[PDB]
RNA sequence: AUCGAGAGGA
DNA sequence: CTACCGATAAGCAGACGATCCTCTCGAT
């Protein structure tokens, strides 16, 4: 640790989470592809609440929908926002992403490409699991604090 | 998930888009058949799983002399007759939870005190 | 009797302690082949050899 | 060992040897300790091979 | 080990025949999606067909081996949870004999099948030297088992200290495990038979650190004696 | 030691129940994973430690 | 009993966990490559996609398993009938070649005759099932050191290997003394002298010894003590 | 291989006691302990001399030539 | 009584029952008897028949010697050791020779014998016979 | 005598 | 706006593998 600012335990946790490498694969319960044609509406009743919002502070009928383990979303300091912007800035301008609030009943991220298009969304979800670095330095797998 | 087969060919049915009417159609590409879809769910992955936990829990499970027998009560056949085991889902990061079988009504219960359970 | 070594009673050896016979056997045959060349068992002497 | 039930994780089930050389090992204990001993003989034979080559 | 043997290798064909005469659809008539519970049946790695209700199939098979009518050295492994029943007449399989524990008396509640009565007739035969190993084997008092079958049985270690029930202790004695499983199928003839010919000479091996025991078995072979009388 | 044998015995015996409890704990899904290791890995670690200490 | 044909079959699941396009191909003896499994299944008898899976996945509700086999079906879409499946393997005369391999070399235990397929077809389904049941991480890899899966070869089986070789070399020699008798000289020494050599040396082979079975099988007893 | 003369460890003659011992065991049905005692073998080294002894000469004599 | 359970003592009675009936090298002997009694007949039938010469029932003598220039002696283990010979029985087979009609008993080498197997002389000798034969009982 | 093989010692 | 190259990844090949020692056995 910095010669500071060297025995400050909580200051040391910050550094760990800064380097311990985290993939999206390691937080997702399941991934699903649904046919949901109404960009403005959902066949899935669970969501719905989520759909009205994210129009405030063209697409495709093919919805990709992820579910994130709330349990392991604390074992690493992860907010839905970071998880989203992270996805967002990968594909930048050809994937439209929405997501659930951080403390909702379930944690979900919904994405649409922006035919033969049933197959392209499935290749994305490969990149999405096996290529998104949430935070940390690749290779640095597990990390332990010691005194 | 669940997916289906052709009524005539008996082959795999691949999904296709209605476009005009906004609905999902499976079709076979061996013959010509075409049906409307039953769910909107087309594909599903699961990384953290459940299926294959209770595994081959079958009638004669009582006769298996190598399963241990606990002293638990059973949630419904209020019997104290049961066999038990750890998640058959043999994988590095599975919990250590026990699953019980009421050798009286074959009701499957768990030793778990954190998780919800519908088997 | 140090470092995996031992002291043994000479008196009790004399009385036959841990005694063994040892046998060895030696084998031999006359010749291997020839219709007119056989080896001989004999107590040999000279003859030019 | 097949004298045990399934999913038994207790000490004795997996190699703990409650006894001492004076008290004497139980049948199970005897076997487990045997399994442990073999592992020792094995890499003594393997060490001397490895180190004999390192030295050279 | 002392008491182990090797399969010589019988002919499968009486069994295959017997099987398809006690249920068991052959394989080409089998339709999976309509009889999913069917325990599938293998002989020597050949899948001959399936069988619903295998707990009677298996109960007959075992009673036939213990009658003698199926060669005692054939091994039969019913796997309850894997829905499989596998029979091996393969030659060259190692196996060892052990006592057969059986539900007796009341639906407790296990006993050994050998009794004091049986032991007396064996010793009758020893002293007057009628009733032989084969006698024990033919009357289903004793059984052969190979590692594969070993997989599906619960073995006791000693008749007494592994099942008299429950109702003080000597401090010098080695500390016991438990009963703690009351669902036995077999009992060890004796634990000391796990040892081979050489380690059988070691006095108190259970008080020795194991690698030594190995050393002694290297040296027992090198010791002068009297290899033969003639 | 007569008395010493009793101690040694009641000393292992505590490490017996101490393992019981952790096991009993893990079976009821209230065992938490030590950062960076599996649920079952941490159990083995705990148990192996309670047993080395027991011996020593 | 009689003849030793160790032809090993591999069913191998391509593409890692994380990698997509998880095909299942298989290795056939004599066969220059590895064939998608759905071609094998046609090549046998089974043609319709849903029957092939029937022979593999024994449960209608096992969506995960089924899901895994979706890329296999696409893998064999280019082929849709017995005669063209058999054709991939390997004139026209190459169809014949394949029809034999499936019945002579492919899983020779079971049968080696003609009228079966259905049995070889179910067993392949069983292998596949077992493989997938393992990639799905629902049953473990196999213990390669489980004594119930090993066999000890003794005097009989050893001598029987040897005798076959010797007796066939004897038998081949009479077909040769049959020819030269253009218009009773049985070389007994072959069997006598051959069996001695393998019991004399360790070389379980007769004048080959390249066969490292020479590992001294058969060595000079040992009589230092009754116990030795 | 015949009863050795003289206990190894001490030197007391035991070579003349094999016959008597076999008789005290068979004829008077005695036990090896009181057999040995009666033959005047007190120190446990001489006791081992006879108690251990295996008489293989009998089996050697059984070969005809 | 006699229906009574067994104690750990009574188990040596049974180990004694074993061993009395199988001895110590049974797994050697059983391998060999299986080879001789059954398996050896099979190796004969296979590619066996020729193209017409066919084979049949195989016969195994009791071990003997071929005393060059002289008689066929019946050979015992002791003599074999001493004379550096091979304790081995001869093999005889039924060889049929079918000369069609149209369309349109025999020595076959010597098999070494495992001692104290069924085919060996020692296999059913009483202890006194063994001393006579100089083989150790 | 040599080539190989096997057993065994620290 | 297709080809040419120097370039980074993907893929079968191998030469080692403790010292010294002792004995015996088959084959040539
Ligand atoms: Zn169709
Ligand atoms: Zn119940
Ligand atoms: Zn004395």
Q: Are residues B99 and B53 in the same domain?
A: yes
Say how many CA atoms lie within 13 Å of G185 toward its Cβ.
Answer: 9
CB within 8 Å: B17 and A28: no
What ligand has the least distance to the C-alpha of B8?
1
The domain defined by G1-143 carries CATH number 3.90.1110.10: yes
Q: How far is B54 from chain G (nearest CA, A)?
A: 11
- Show which positions of strand K are touched by protein (CB under 7 A): 17-19, 24-27
CATH code of the domain in which B18 resides: 2.20.25.10
Q: What is the DSSP letter of A24?
A: G
Distance CA(G193)–CA(G206), nearest Å, equals 9
Element containing residue D52 per DSSP (H, E): helix D27-55
CB within 8 Å: I26 and E5: yes
Q: Does B48 touch chain F (CB under 8 A)?
A: no
Q: Are residues B94 and B55 in the same domain?
A: yes
Distance CA(B116)–CA(I80), nearest Å, equals 80
Distance CA(B85)–CA(C7), nearest Å, equals 60
Q: Does G164 touch chain B (CB under 8 A)?
A: no
Distance CA(G74)–CA(E147), nearest Å, equals 42
Q: Does A127 touch chain G (CB under 8 A)?
A: no
At how many degrees (to 10) do helices G118-135 and G63-75 cross?
Answer: 120
Q: Which residue has the tokens 């032991």?
A: E119
| Three-state SS at F5 | helix
Cα dist. B58→E36, G56, G107 in Å?
11, 21, 31
Chains I and A touch (3+ CB pairs under 8 A): no
Question: Which of C4, C28, C30, C42 does the annotation list as catalytic?
Answer: C4
* Token code pair at residue G9: 């079959």
Considering only CB atoms, which chain E residues are within 8 Å of B64?
A: 80-81, 152
Q: Are residues B98 and B53 in the same domain?
A: yes
Nearest to residue G5, comparing CAs of G164, G213, G175? G164
Q: Are residues B57 and B89 in the same domain?
A: yes
3-state secondary structure E59-90: HHHHHHHCCCCCCCCCEEEEECCCCEEEEECC
Q: What is the DSSP letter of B12?
A: B
Q: Does D50 touch chain F (CB under 8 A)?
A: no
Q: Are residues B103 and B62 in the same domain?
A: yes
CB within 8 Å: F19 and D18: no
Residues paired with E98 in a beta bridge: E143
Q: How far is G115 from chain E (nearest CA, A)?
A: 11
What ligand has the least distance to the C-alpha of H13?
3
Runs of H (alpha helix) within chain I: 11-15, 17-20, 26-34, 40-44, 77-82, 127-132
Nearest to residue F50, comparing CAs of G63, D11, D25, E162? D11
Distance CA(B75)–CA(G30), nearest Å, equals 59
* Token code pair at residue D21: 């050389």
* Residue B12 CB partners (closer than 8 Å, separation 6+): B3, B5, B28, G49, G50, G70, G73
- What residue numbers bound the domain in which B1 lies? 1-45
* Token code pair at residue H58: 């009998």
Q: Are residues B62 and B112 in the same domain?
A: yes
Residue D54 beta carbon within 7 A of nucleic strand K = no
The answer, yes or no, to whether the previous bond of G92 is cis (omega within 30 of 0) is yes
Q: Which residue is nearest to nucleotide J6 (CA to C1')?
A: G216
Residue G196 beta carbon within 7 A of nucleic strand K = yes
Residue G216 beta carbon within 7 A of nucleic strand J = yes
Q: Does G55 touch chain E (CB under 8 A)?
A: yes
| Three-state SS at B84 | strand
Q: What is the DSSP letter of G10?
A: E
Residue G213 beta carbon within 7 A of nucleic strand J = no
Task: Give the distance, in angstroms, between the CA of residue E91 and the centroid of all CA atoms in the same chain.
Answer: 17
Binding residues of C: 4
* Token code pair at residue A44: 């899935």
Mark which residues 133-162 of G lie under 8 Å from B by CB: 136-140
CB within 8 Å: F36 and A145: no
Runs of H (alpha helix) within A6-119: 9-19, 49-52, 80-91
Q: Does H15 touch chain C (CB under 8 A)?
A: no
H39 and H15 Cβ atoms separated by less than 8 Å: no
Nearest to residue G198, comparing CAs of G162, G154, G156? G162
Query: What was the structure determination method?
Result: X-ray
Distance CA(E229)–CA(E65), nearest Å, equals 42
Length of chain F: 56
Give distance in angstroms: CA of B10 to centre of ligand 1: 6
The answer, yes or no, to whether the previous bond of A5 is cis (omega within 30 of 0) is yes
Residues paired with A32 in a beta bridge: A65, B44
Distance CA(E172)–CA(D24), nearest Å, equals 10
Cα dist. F43→B70, E49, E83, G153 in Å?
21, 43, 32, 43
Q: Does A123 touch chain G (CB under 8 A)?
A: yes
Find the residue in F nearest to A75 (Cα).
F35
Q: What is the DSSP letter of H65?
A: -
Q: Is H46 one of the annotated binding-site residues?
A: yes
What one-character-per-residue DSSP string does chain C give? Answer: -TTT-----HHHHHTTTT-----------S-SS-SS-----S----TT-
| Three-state SS at E122 | helix
Cα dist. G61→A37, B38, B45, E37, G173 in Å?
28, 16, 15, 14, 62
The b/e string for A8-19 (b: 16+ C-beta within 10 A; e otherwise) is eeeebeeebeee
* Residue E53 CB partners (closer than 8 Å, separation 6+): E23
Gaps in chain A (C to N over 2.5 angstroms) fall after 57, 114
Considering only CB atoms, which chain E residues are within 8 Å of G118?
A: 27-28
Residue G220 beta carbon within 7 A of nucleic strand K = yes
* Residue E60 CB partners (closer than 8 Å, separation 6+): E22
Residues paired with E43 in a beta bridge: E46, E87
Nearest to residue A98, comparing CAs of A82, A86, A84? A84
Query: Among all strands, which nt has the closest C1' to G216 (CA)?
Result: J6
Residues bordering ligand 2, an ion, CB closer than 5 Å: B 74, 76-77, 102, 105, 107
Q: Which residue has the tokens 């066919």?
A: I54
Q: What is the DSSP letter of E1?
A: -
Q: Is B23 one of the annotated binding-site residues?
A: no
Q: How far is B78 from chain G (nearest CA, A)?
A: 31
Q: Are residues B32 and B74 in the same domain?
A: no
Any catalytic annotation for residue C4? yes
Burial class (CB in 10 A: 0-12, 13-18, 19+), D52: exposed
Nearest to residue B36, comparing CAs of B27, B48, B46? B27
Tell me which residues from 7 to 46 on chain C have a beta carbon below 7 angstroms from nucleic acid strand K: 24
Find the residue in H nearest to E226 (Cα).
H56
Domain A22-136 adopts which CATH fold?
A: Gyrase A; domain 2 (3.30.1360)
Task: Give the distance, in angstroms, between the CA of residue E154 and the centroid of all CA atoms in the same chain.
Answer: 10
Q: Are residues B55 and B2 in the same domain?
A: no
How far in angstroms lies nucleotide J5's C1' from the CA of residue I85?
A: 22
* Token code pair at residue D27: 């049948």
| Three-state SS at B27 | strand
Domains and CATH numbers, chain H: 1-65 (1.10.10.60)
The b/e string for F10-35 (b: 16+ C-beta within 10 A; e otherwise) is eebeebbebbeebbeebbbbebeeee
Residue G207 beta carbon within 7 A of nucleic strand J = no
Considering only CB atoms, which chain I residues are within 8 Å of E196?
A: none
Residues paired with B84 in a beta bridge: B100
Q: Are residues B40 and B58 in the same domain?
A: no
Q: Are residues B25 and B80 in the same domain?
A: no
Q: Does E171 touch chain F (CB under 8 A)?
A: yes
CB within 8 Å: E142 and I31: no
Find the residue in E nearest to G59 (Cα).
E33
Count other C-beta atoms under 10 Å from residue B20's C-beta: 6
Distance CA(G120)–CA(D36), nearest Å, equals 44
* φ and ψ at residue H42, rounded to 5 degrees: -95, -65
At how many degrees (to 10) do helices A80-91 and A120-130 cross?
Answer: 120
How far in angstroms lies nucleotide K6's C1' from the CA of residue G170?
A: 64
What one-character-per-residue DSSP string does H4-20 give? Answer: PSS-TTT----TTSHHH
CB within 8 Å: A35 and B45: no
* Token code pair at residue H52: 């251990």
* Token code pair at residue G48: 């319709």
Data resolution in angstroms: 2.9
Give distance in angstroms: CA of C7 to centre of ligand 3: 19
Interstrand relation of A22-23 and A133-135 (parallel, antiparallel or unpaired): antiparallel
Q: Does H61 touch chain I (CB under 8 A)?
A: no
E90 and E10 Cβ atoms separated by less than 8 Å: no
What ligand has the least distance to the C-alpha of B28?
1
- Sign (positive/negative) of CA torsion G29, G35, G37, G42? negative
Pick E206's closest partner by Cβ from D25, D36, D38.
D25
Count other C-beta atoms under 10 Å from residue E94's C-beta: 17
Distance CA(C17)–CA(C14), nearest Å, equals 7
Say how many CA atoms lie within 13 Å of A16 toward its Cβ.
Answer: 16
At how many degrees (to 10) do helices G118-135 and G37-44 cross?
Answer: 160
Query: Among all strands, which nt has the closest C1' to D48 (CA)?
Result: K18
Q: What is the DSSP letter of I128?
A: H
Domain E9-90 adopts which CATH fold?
A: Hypothetical Protein Ta0175; Chain: A, domain 2 (3.90.1070)
Q: What is the DSSP letter of G161?
A: H
Q: What is the DSSP letter of F30?
A: -
Find the residue in B nearest to D3 (Cα).
B66
How far in angstroms lies nucleotide J5's C1' from the CA of residue E222?
A: 22
Nearest to residue I112, comparing CAs of I24, I55, I37, I32? I32
- Show which positions of strand J are touched by protein (CB under 7 A): 4-9
Considering only CB atoms, which chain I residues are within 8 Å of G170?
A: 108-109
Q: Are residues B13 and B36 in the same domain?
A: yes
Q: Are residues B41 and B72 in the same domain?
A: no
Nearest to residue G27, comparing CAs of G105, G85, G133? G105
Residues paired with B24 in a beta bridge: B17
Q: Does I129 touch chain H (CB under 8 A)?
A: no
Element containing residue B110 per DSSP (H, E): strand B108-110
Residue E222 beta carbon within 7 A of nucleic strand J = yes
E199 and D31 Cβ atoms separated by less than 8 Å: no
């Amino acid at each position: 640790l910095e010669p500071g600012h060297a025995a400050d335990q909580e200051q040391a946790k910050l550094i760990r989470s800064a380097i311990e490498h985290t993939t999206l694969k390691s937080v997702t319960i399941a991934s699903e592809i649904y046919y949901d044609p109404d960009p403005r509406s959902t066949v899935i009743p669970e969501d719905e609440e989520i759909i009205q919002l994210h129009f405030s502070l063209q697409q495709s009928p093919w919805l990709l929908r992820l579910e994130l383990d709330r349990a392991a979303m604390n074992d690493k300091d992860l907010t839905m926002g970071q998880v989203g912007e992270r996805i967002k800035q990968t594909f930048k301008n050809d994937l439209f992403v929405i997501w659930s609030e951080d403390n909702d009943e379930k944690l979900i991220i919904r994405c649409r490409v922006v035919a033969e298009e049933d197959h392209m969304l499935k290749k994305i979800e490969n990149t999405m699991l096996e290529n998104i670095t949430l935070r940390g330095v690749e290779n640095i797998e597990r990390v332990v604090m010691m005194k | 998930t669940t997916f289906r087969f052709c009524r005539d060919c008996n082959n795999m049915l691949y999904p296709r888009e209605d476009k005009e009417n906004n609905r999902l159609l499976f079709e076979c590409r061996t013959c010509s058949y075409v049906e409307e879809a039953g769910s909107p769910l087309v594909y599903r992955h699961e990384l953290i799983t459940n299926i294959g936990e209770t595994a081959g829990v079958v009638q004669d499970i009582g006769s298996d002399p190598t399963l241990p027998r606990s002293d638990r009560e059973c949630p419904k056949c209020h019997s104290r007759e049961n066999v038990f085991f750890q998640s058959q889902q043999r994988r590095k990061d599975t919990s250590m939870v026990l699953f019980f079988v009421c050798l009286s009504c074959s009701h499957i219960f768990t030793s778990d005190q954190k998780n919800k359970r519908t088997q | 009797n140090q470092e995996d070594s031992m002291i043994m009673n000479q008196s009790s050896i004399d009385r036959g302690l841990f005694r063994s016979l040892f046998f060895r056997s030696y084998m031999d045959q006359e010749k291997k082949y020839g219709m007119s060349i056989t080896e001989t068992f004999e107590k040999p002497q000279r003859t030019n050899t | 060992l097949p004298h045990f039930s399934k999913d038994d994780y207790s000490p004795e089930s997996k190699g703990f040897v409650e006894n001492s050389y004076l008290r004497g090992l139980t049948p199970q204990e005897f076997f487990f300790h045997a399994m442990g001993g073999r592992e020792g003989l094995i890499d003594t034979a393997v060490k001397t091979a490895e180190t004999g080559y390192i030295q050279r | 080990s002392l008491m182990s043997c090797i399969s010589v290798g019988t002919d499968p064909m009486p069994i295959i025949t017997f099987l398809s005469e006690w249920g068991m659809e052959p394989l080409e008539d089998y339709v999976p999606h309509q009889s999913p519970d069917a325990t599938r049946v293998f002989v020597n790695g050949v899948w001959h067909g399936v069988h619903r209700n295998p707990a009677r199939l298996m109960e007959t098979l075992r009673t036939l081996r213990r009658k003698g009518d199926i060669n005692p050295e054939v091994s039969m492994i019913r796997d309850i949870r894997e829905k499989e029943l596998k029979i091996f007449t393969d030659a060259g399989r190692v196996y060892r004999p052990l006592f057969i524990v059986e539900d007796d008396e009341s639906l407790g509640h296990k006993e050994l099948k050998v009794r004091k009565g049986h032991i007396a007739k064996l010793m009758a035969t020893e002293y007057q030297d009628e009733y032989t190993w084969s006698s024990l084997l033919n009357e289903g008092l004793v059984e052969y088992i190979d590692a594969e079958e070993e997989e599906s049985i619960l073995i006791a270690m000693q008749p007494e200290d592994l099942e008299p029930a429950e109702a003080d202790v000597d401090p010098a004695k080695r500390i016991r495990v438990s009963h703690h499983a009351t669902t036995f199928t077999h009992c060890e003839i004796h634990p000391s038979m796990i040892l081979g010919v050489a380690a059988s000479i070691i006095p108190f091996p259970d008080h020795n650190q194991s690698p030594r025991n190995t050393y002694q078995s290297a040296m027992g072979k090198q010791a002068m004696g009297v290899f033969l009388t003639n | 030691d007569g008395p010493t044998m009793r101690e040694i015995t009641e000393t292992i015996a505590e490490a017996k129940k101490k393992v019981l409890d952790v096991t009993k704990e893990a079976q009821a899904n209230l065992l938490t994973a030590k950062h960076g290791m599996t649920l079952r890995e941490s159990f083995e670690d705990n148990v192996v430690r309670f047993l080395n200490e027991a011996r020593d | 009993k009689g003849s030793r044909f160790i032809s090993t079959l591999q069913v191998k699941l391509y593409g890692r966990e994380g990698s997509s396009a998880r095909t299942i191909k298989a290795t056939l003896p004599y066969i220059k490559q590895d064939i998608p499994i759905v071609i094998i299944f046609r090549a046998l008898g089974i043609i319709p996609d849903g029957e092939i899976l029937e022979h593999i996945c024994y449960d209608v509700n096992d969506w995960q398993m089924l899901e895994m086999l979706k890329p296999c079906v696409e893998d064999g879409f280019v082929i849709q009938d017995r005669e063209t499946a058999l054709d991939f393997i390997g004139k026209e005369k190459r169809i014949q070649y394949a029809k034999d391999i499936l019945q002579k070399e492919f899983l020779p235990h079971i049968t080696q005759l003609e009228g079966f397929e259905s049995r070889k077809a179910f067993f392949l389904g069983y292998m596949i099932n077992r493989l997938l049941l393992c990639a799905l991480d629902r049953k473990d890899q196999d213990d390669r050191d489980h004594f119930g899966k090993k066999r000890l070869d003794l005097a009989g089986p050893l001598l029987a290997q040897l005798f076959k070789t010797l007796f066939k070399k004897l038998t081949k020699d009479i077909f040769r003394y049959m020819q030269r008798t253009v218009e009773l000289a049985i070389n007994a020494k072959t069997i006598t002298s051959g069996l001695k050599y393998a019991l004399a040396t360790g070389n379980w082979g007769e004048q080959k010894k390249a066969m490292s079975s020479r590992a001294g099988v058969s060595q000079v007893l040992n009589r230092y003590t009754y116990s030795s | 291989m015949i009863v050795p003369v003289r206990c190894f460890s001490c030197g007391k003659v035991v070579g003349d006691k094999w016959e008597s011992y076999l008789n005290l065991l068979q004829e008077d049905e005695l036990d090896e302990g009181t057999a040995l005692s009666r033959l005047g073998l007190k120190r446990y080294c001489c006791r081992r001399m006879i108690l251990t002894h295996v008489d293989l000469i009998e089996k050697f004599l059984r070969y005809n030539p | 009584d006699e229906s009574a359970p067994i104690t750990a003592e009574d188990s040596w009675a049974v180990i004694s029952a074993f061993f009395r009936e199988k001895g110590l090298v049974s797994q050697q002997l059983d391998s060999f008897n299986q080879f001789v009694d059954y398996t050896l007949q099979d190796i004969i039938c296979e590619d066996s028949t020729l193209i017409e010469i066919s084979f049949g029932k195989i016969y195994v003598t009791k071990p003997m010697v071929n005393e060059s220039d002289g008689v066929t002696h019946a050979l015992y283990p002791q003599e074999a050791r001493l004379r550096n010979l091979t304790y081995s029985s001869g093999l005889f087979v039924d060889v049929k020779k079918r000369t069609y009609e149209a369309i349109d008993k025999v020595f076959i080498g010597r098999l070494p014998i495992m001692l104290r197997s069924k085919n060996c002389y020692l296999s059913e000798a009483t202890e006194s016979d063994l001393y006579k034969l100089k083989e150790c009982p």
